[PDB]
Design a protein around this motif. Structure first.
Motif, mmCIF file in Angstrom:
data_model
loop_
_atom_site.group_PDB
_atom_site.id
_atom_site.type_symbol
_atom_site.label_atom_id
_atom_site.label_comp_id
_atom_site.label_asym_id
_atom_site.label_seq_id
_atom_site.Cartn_x
_atom_site.Cartn_y
_atom_site.Cartn_z
ATOM 1 N N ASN A 295 -50.884 -8.340 1.998
ATOM 2 C CA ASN A 295 -51.482 -6.957 1.066
ATOM 3 C C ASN A 295 -51.026 -6.288 2.490
ATOM 4 N N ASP B 220 -59.060 -5.202 -0.236
ATOM 5 C CA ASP B 220 -58.555 -6.107 -0.568
ATOM 6 C C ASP B 220 -58.693 -7.689 0.341
ATOM 7 N N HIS C 3 -48.814 -7.058 -3.939
ATOM 8 C CA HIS C 3 -48.728 -6.794 -4.748
ATOM 9 C C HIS C 3 -48.259 -5.769 -4.938
ATOM 10 N N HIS C 4 -47.008 -4.775 -4.501
ATOM 11 C CA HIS C 4 -46.563 -4.039 -4.644
ATOM 12 C C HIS C 4 -45.200 -4.180 -4.733
ATOM 13 N N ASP D 69 -56.476 0.186 -4.919
ATOM 14 C CA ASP D 69 -55.122 0.528 -4.892
ATOM 15 C C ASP D 69 -54.560 1.837 -6.244
HETATM 16 MN MN LIG Z 1 -52.212 -2.945 -2.250
#
Ligand SMILES: [Mn+2]
Ligand SMILES: [Mn+2]
Lengths: 293, 294
Positions: free
Chosen positions: B51, B11, B64-65, B108
């Protein structure tokens, strides 16, 4: 003509025992076992078995221990075998240095464990805890090297033994890694009064090195913490140990580690800490150990 | 131009490629989430973060969490996909990079097939090569610097050409040999107990590098695994428990199970450290409970 099978632990004491019994033409077989497999009854023992450094079995030919020929004031089972068969009355004078090395309860000097030589070097590079085998697949296995070393030590000097291809391959890797481990320590080790903290969690590689290097490099500390990644970097492992070169630490490490869900005994322990808590627990460990002195 | 702060993973690599291709970044710093969270990373307004946990002073933070500088899409499968979509998708980036993007979106979520994780190829191979959990890292150049050669090369060469670069090809050869030995020891040292495979590695001299999904791909009838391994300097025993990415049906809360023994984790993965004298009892208790959970 009649010979015996040696049953012993896979360690330096066991290698030396085998060298002594092989030299006087007393064993022709050897079997390395785990102590608890002996305690549990998974190793069949006959009257053709010699046991060293393991729990007693009644129907064995001979049993040498040091914690049935037992001397609890001997620092190793090899020493019991040595004195029982005469010592230098029976064995070559050159082997007194072999016996010196096997007898080291960790009575080393700091110098001895930095850039080790002779029998000490052989001991450290064979010890699973040095980690040579984790870090490389050698030409032959450590098990098969131990096997071959038994007879070769009976008729070669230590300097020749150290020149054998399959040993020297391990020596060269041990030297390389020790150098890189010591520079790693100089970059990553932080002293807090009596405690050296080795934070490895930002290093790409960890290196093999014998378990006394860190203590030898910080002779003013009596306790160390290794801070490391757990399995697949899922958590943080704190491993705490007392120095063999300054034995004065008043921390009971096992009890301390207990507070954090770990264990150990007085002189060594570990715990496992979630990543979001590891900074808090590190500060607390350091505070508590500094308070203890 | 800006400095990219990201993780040293696939990523992170793809994010750097995208941001470098639109001439947004001219320096990069690799860090772990725990150093961000613990406040060990100096973040300034010259920094773009992807990230990683949000830190307040940055120019932009791509996440993106599950405020105005925080570009977050909790349903995106990678931070690279957030970057891609934020800057306009295939208008801004070569349409040929959709294959790279497809690969980075698998990470992920571990949305892999069994055949993709065994004898991997292409972008999947590079992903597993760069994943620290594969365990590859004594090479000519550090994984840090390789990641740097990779960022440039990914902007103009093909994945097949990249896997032929000398510093990459030398990692690929090691990965292939280690995977071969890993699969051998996983199949010889594993024992299935209904839904669980227990991998007892305590008598192996070497544990080989392999990507973290191989075990599940060799035991597709199991939804959960335990690695039994030596801890630090063989002082204790480590049990590491994980759910399968191919059979996602395990009913065990692993983190809560490990907690009883002084460990922890989350629902899908956890570990504990056990005294040598307690290891046989705890092994049987873990198996029993996992078998009762299904
Ligand atoms: Mn991630
Ligand atoms: Mn002993």
């Amino acid at each position: 003509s009649l010979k015996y099978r040696l049953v012993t632990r896979s360690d330096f004491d066991g290698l030396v025992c085998a060298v002594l019994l092989k030299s006087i033409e007393l064993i022709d077989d050897i079997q390395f076992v785990h102590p608890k497999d002996m305690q549990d009854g998974k190793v069949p023992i006959t009257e053709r078995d010699i046991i060293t450094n393991l729990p007693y079995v009644a129907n064995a030919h001979l049993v040498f221990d040091h914690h049935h020929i037992i001397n609890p004031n001997a620092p190793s089972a090899a020493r019991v075998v040595w004195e029982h068969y005469g010592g230098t009355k029976t064995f070559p004078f050159e082997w007194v240095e072999m016996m010196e090395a096997v007898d080291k309860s960790a009575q080393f000097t700091r110098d001895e464990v930095l850039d080790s030589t002779g029998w000490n070097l052989l001991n450290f590079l064979m010890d699973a805890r040095t980690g040579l085998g984790r870090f490389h697949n050698f030409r032959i296995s450590n098990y098969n090297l131990m096997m071959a070393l038994i007879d070769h030590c009976t008729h070669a000097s230590i300097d020749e033994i150290l020149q054998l291809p399959d040993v020297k391959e391990r020596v060269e890797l041990y030297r390389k890694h020790e150098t890189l481990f010591k520079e790693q320590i100089q970059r990553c080790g932080k002293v807090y009064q009596n405690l050296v903290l080795l934070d490895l969690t930002e290093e790409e590689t960890i290196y093999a090195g014998n378990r006394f290097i860190i203590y030898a490099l910080y002779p003013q500390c009596n306790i160390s913490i290794h801070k490391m990644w757990g399995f697949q970097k899922q958590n943080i492992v704190f491993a705490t140990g007392k120095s063999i070169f300054d034995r004065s630490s008043r921390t009971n490490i096992g009890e301390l580690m207990l507070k954090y869900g770990g264990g150990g005994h007085a002189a060594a322990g570990t715990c496992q800490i979630a990543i979001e808590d590891a900074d808090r627990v590190e500060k607390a460990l350091i505070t508590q150990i500094n308070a203890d002195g």
